Amino acid sequence: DTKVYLLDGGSLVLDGYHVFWNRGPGGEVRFPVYSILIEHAEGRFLIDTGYDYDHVMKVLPFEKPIQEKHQTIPGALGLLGLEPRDIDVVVNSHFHFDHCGGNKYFPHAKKICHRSEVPQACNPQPFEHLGYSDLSFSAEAAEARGATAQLLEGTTRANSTFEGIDGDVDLARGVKLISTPGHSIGHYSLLVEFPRRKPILFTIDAAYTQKSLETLCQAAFHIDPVAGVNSMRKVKKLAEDHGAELMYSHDMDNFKTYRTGTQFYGHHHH
Amino acid sequence: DTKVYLLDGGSLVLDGYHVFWNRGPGGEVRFPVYSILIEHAEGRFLIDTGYDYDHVMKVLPFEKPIQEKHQTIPGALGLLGLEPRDIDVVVNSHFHFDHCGGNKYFPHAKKICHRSEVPQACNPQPFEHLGYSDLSFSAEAAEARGATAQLLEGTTRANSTFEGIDGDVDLARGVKLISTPGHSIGHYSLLVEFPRRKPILFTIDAAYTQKSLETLCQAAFHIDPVAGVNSMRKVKKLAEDHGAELMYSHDMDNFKTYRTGTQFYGHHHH
Ligand SMILES: Cc1ncc2c(c1O)COC2=O
Ligand SMILES: Cc1ncc2c(c1O)COC2=O
Ligand SMILES: Cc1ncc2c(c1O)COC2=O
Ligand SMILES: Cc1ncc2c(c1O)COC2=O
Ligand SMILES: [Zn+2]
Ligand SMILES: [Zn+2]
Ligand SMILES: [Zn+2]
Ligand SMILES: [Zn+2]
Structure with missing residues (x-):
């Protein structure tokens, strides 16, 4: 029928000026x-894979x-009651470290990302190195960046090739990847439709929080802030023109109301 | 990949002479x-649906x-984390009450049984009335037997029609229904193949216990005991010619070693 499970991946800390570009205010902020x-009639799709704890403790312990x-x-x-092996397709919104930390566990799955993201990971802007700091998702990107020491044993180029896409696409029926560049070159958001509840628009990193979307204040991590703002406009209109419940990527106060673990969205209505 | 979950449906009591036709010995025997x-790449298949507790307490409290x-x-x-609604196909080995007690909860699923079983349920031998005592699986059979009082609200002829089959059949890839008549006119056993463990041959009512199969001693409930014995021979050879682990329907001492609940057969071998 289509169920959506949120895999709770713990939390991280940024300054308020990171989360709210120039606006803030400052001071430490913890976000999930x-x-x-x-889980869909066409397979089990995993969108993003969180952050790898050892990677963060080594490179971003702050x-x-x-x-x-x-x-x-x-x-x-x-x-x-699932294992990484039960997942048929892994989709990455983009290759910032907190969204591809777990890709290493899915050699057997089909991988999908935007056409431009693997090239970006191999060779990012000088201000993007830290965002693209975990290359364990791709044997190729790890090589280019000289970080093959991150590769999990058994990761080869063969079991970590992505199918590059572009523009808005149907992942499966009722499931669209919505193109939302700006935050990163090939950033995608996600729209999931159900049969007895209103669609869910997952913003991922196009909108960190409800506050972000409300004030068009993007995160301070971006490659193109004009694009970033247009992508917020696009996500706001999408939500309106559909019925969508907006679910945000890194919004602690909103996250507390989200179903994680054994709880899911898309229940059968008797 | 194909996982098999056993749904533990509690227990019942027969005399030893029921379980072991003429051989016994006698005295109460409790069996599961x-x-x-x-769970298969082609859908979720449920084979049999246990006994309905109210039905047994009313009609077979002994x-x-x-x-x-x-x-x-x-x-x-x-x-x-499943509901009856998540099941795509319900298969009934036969329509004895302890194997179709839960069919009433699956109006939306496709139903499959042997061609002869619904007609048998509508109009059984005089010595079969008790075996075919729960007609809630079929609006039609309930009518014919004048037991429409068993029908759960919302059960119609439309949502309880079976696709009749005959002979050995592939339910899905690696999943065969093995024809084993005798115990009932259209009784089926089940063979499930996996990719990293030996096939499982579920005998259902063709062999109640390991002891049954070992001595060719069938249950005292049967329509044709010559057929019943041939079906045991067929199940023994099937198991040999394949690699199959034989799992029995009503064998308390063997049941204790069976995985039920969250445990399943067909794990990925890393
Ligand atoms: C580790 C950790 N950090 C944040 C949250 C949780 C965590 O386990 C659970 O719900 C949360 O918001
Ligand atoms: C959480 C987090 N930390 C650092 C960076 C990003 C993050 O999302 C994106 O680009 C970064 O440098
Ligand atoms: C009610 C009941 N009867 C038998 C068994 C169980 C029961 O809950 C569990 O394992 C059993 O063998
Ligand atoms: C468990 C049980 N009880 C009664 C009957 C059957 C049973 O399996 C089959 O035919 C019957 O009359
Ligand atoms: Zn990001
Ligand atoms: Zn993020
Ligand atoms: Zn039976
Ligand atoms: Zn039985």
Whole structure:
């Protein structure tokens, strides 16, 4: 019928000026990170794979990760009686480290990302190195960036090739990847339709929080802030023209009301 | 990949002479009843649906049913985060009451049984009335037997029509219904193949216990005991010629070693 499970992936810390470009205010802010499991008649799709705890502790310990073992990808799938192997397709919104930390566990799945994202990861802008700091999702990108030491044993170029896409696309029936560049060169948001509840528009990094979308204030991490704003406009109109419940990527106060673990969206209405 | 879940449906009591036709020995014997959930790339298949507790307490209280609420069909599916609605196909080995008690919860699923079983249920041998005592699986059979009082509200002829089959058939890839008549006119056993463990041959009522199969001693409930014995021979050879682990329908001492609830057969071998 289509169910959506949120895999709770723990949390990270940014300054308020990171979350709210120039606006802020400043001071530490902790936000959640999660992934999106779609159980669908055409297969099990995982959208993003959270952050890898060792990677963050090594490279971004100032983000002070807190992630319990049920909040790794295999752990969170564990709560559903699932293993990484049960996932048929992994989709990455973009290759910032907190959205592709768990790709390494899916050599057998088909991978999908925007055409431009793997090239970006191999060779990012000088201000993007930190965002694209976990190359374990791609043997190729790891090579180009000289970070093959991140590759999990058994990751080859063969089991980590992506099918590049472009523009708005149907992942499956009732499931659209919505093109939302700006934050990154090939950033995608997600729209999931159900049969007895209103569509869900997952903003991912096009809108970190409700506050972001409300004031058109994007995150300070972006490659193109004009594009970033247009993508917010596009996401706002999309939500309106559909019936969509907007679910945000990194919004602690909103996250508390989100279903994680064994709870899911898309229940049968008797 | 193909997983098999056993839905534990509680237990019932027969005399030893029932379980072991003429051989026995006598005295009360309690045995388990269960159903077979196959999660498969072609859908979720439920083979049999246990016994309905109210039906047994009313009509066969001498069988002294013990069935906790997690051991009804919706309850047992409950332990998997599933509802009756998530099942795509219900297959009935035959329409004895302890194998079709839960059919009433699946109006939306496709139903499959042997060509002869619905006609048998409508109009059984005089010695079969008790076996075919729960007609809630079929609006039509309930009418013919004047037991429409068993029909759950919303059960119509439309949502309880079966596709009749005959001979050995592939339910799905790696999943065969093996024709095993004798115990009932159109009784089927089940063979499930996996990719990293030996096939499982579910005998259902063709062989109640390991002891039954070992000594060719069928249950005392049968329509044709010559056929019944041939079907045991057929099941023994099937198991040999394949690699199959034989799993029996009503074998308490063997049942204790069977995986029920959240445990399943067909794990990925890393
Ligand atoms: C580690 C951690 N950080 C944040 C949250 C949780 C965590 O386990 C659970 O719900 C949360 O918001
Ligand atoms: C959470 C987080 N930390 C650092 C970066 C990003 C993040 O989302 C994106 O680009 C970055 O440098
Ligand atoms: C009610 C009941 N009867 C038998 C068994 C169980 C029961 O809950 C569980 O495992 C069994 O063998
Ligand atoms: C368990 C049980 N009880 C009664 C009958 C059957 C049973 O399996 C089959 O035919 C019957 O009359
Ligand atoms: Zn990002
Ligand atoms: Zn992010
Ligand atoms: Zn029977
Ligand atoms: Zn039986």
